[PDB]
Amino acid sequence: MGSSHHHHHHSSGLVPRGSHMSDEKTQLIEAFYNFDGDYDGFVSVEEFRGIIRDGLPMTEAEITEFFEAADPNNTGFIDYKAFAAMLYSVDES
């Protein structure tokens, strides 16, 4: 079809992945260096806030939307796994 390399199909066949927001994970990579000394799979929101502040570059809408989505009670604690599954949400089933 005329002018297919634009609307029909470009270099990639309608593939949003690959050149998407794959840096949002690398930006958080700073967890291993400033949040991985001697901690299990559980971290409270209170502690997380301090670490995230100068550790992992994240906006409120990401940390806050995750702070509540991670803790059902909203008591101010977090399930490290629930949070880890956010940046590691690339394995279905």
Angle at 2 between CA 19 and CA 14, to 5 degrees: 20
Residue with tokens 């977090």: 78
**Nearest residue to 54 (alpha-carbon basis) of 37, 35, 73:** 35
Query: Per-domain residue ranges for the chain?
Result: 21-87
18: which residues sit within 8 A by CB, 6+ positions away?
Answer: 12
Matching residue, tokens 């690959």: 18
Token digits of residue 32: 């291993």
The CATH number of 21-87 is which of 1.10.238.10, 3.40.50.1000, 3.20.20.140, 1.10.3720.10?
Answer: 1.10.238.10
CA–CA separation, 60 vs 73, rounded Å? Answer: 19
Structure-solving method: NMR
Sign of CA dihedral 49, 50, 53, 54: negative
Instruction: Please check whether residue 31 is in contact with residue 64, taking contact to mean a CB–CB distance below 8 angstroms.
Output: no
